[PDB]
Amino acid sequence: GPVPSRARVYTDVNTHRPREYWDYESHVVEWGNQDDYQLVRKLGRGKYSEVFEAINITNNEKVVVKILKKKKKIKREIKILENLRGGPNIITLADIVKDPVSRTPALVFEHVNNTDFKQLYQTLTDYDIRFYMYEILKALDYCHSMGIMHRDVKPHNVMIDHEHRKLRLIDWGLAEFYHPGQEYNVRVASRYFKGPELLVDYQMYDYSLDMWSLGCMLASMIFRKEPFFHGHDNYDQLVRIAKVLGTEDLYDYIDKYNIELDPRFNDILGRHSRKRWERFVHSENQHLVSPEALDFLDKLLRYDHQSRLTAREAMEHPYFYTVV
């Protein structure tokens, strides 16, 4: 059997809070008025939803409406969003509405004038990345301090209105309350941002999963390679990580937690030395790289979830000296 694990920070936030804080199934929703919103255009779609740009007709403000396609999953997202409302750089849930006849619910968010990261990330300066990384860290330390793991940290879930230097960590639909010893679903986050704990099916993970995901984002931004670890599937995703971090530290990790690796992994992982971060530094990205960026990245991208920086430790890193 695998060795148990608990978060080294905010372990019992949900334990010492009242039942109604984490017990989202008991939360009774007070519905807003659907007729306050006019849908303007489709912005996207997910597995469980469709997203639209809308207008709040009572004040002419732009909003984002997420129309939900499971009752338990709906209440979880709402409770997390309400718990986190007002938190630094956390998307604001402005309203919750429902078709009064069909009962189909929808969440109304504040609008962020985002620039697609495939266009934006190319124009960001060294200072810009440090600033935005510090802003994501504020949201992560906040949600973690409130006993919540985001579990889907990636650039598409980070809205940036660059003109206003405004950042919001969005789509808390995969977010979950942390309870020490709980066995969580490893089928979370986007492939490229999945922590090794998920890829090896280690279910007793915690907030430190978000720090890996953030590490993947930092690497993609300072090295101008999006995504940084580009696997063709979940198995190959771990191979991509092993080709950078090396197999020795991977097998030490599996060994430490007594993880039984899938038979598929053995032959495909092979043997790879740990690469120096400097290897990924080239003429075009060098202006975004510094010894502090590499030391910071190196402390985020650790196989052992218990050895990655916490969001508060990350905010203290010298990489953010000019920002703070």
Ligand SMILES: CC(=O)Nc1cc(Nc2cc(NC3CC3)n3ncc(C#N)c3n2)ccc1N(C)CCN(C)C
């Ligand atoms: C709303 C949400 O939770 N997810 C979401 C938002 C978008 N897109 C946008 C776009 C904008 N602004 C730009 C048009 C200018 N903004 N501004 C604020 C918010 C919020 N919240 C927002 N969302 C697209 C797909 C999705 N999901 C459902 C896809 C799948 N998930 C699992 C990743």
Ligand SMILES: [Cl-]
């Ligand atoms: Cl979705």
Ligand SMILES: [Cl-]
């Ligand atoms: Cl943290």
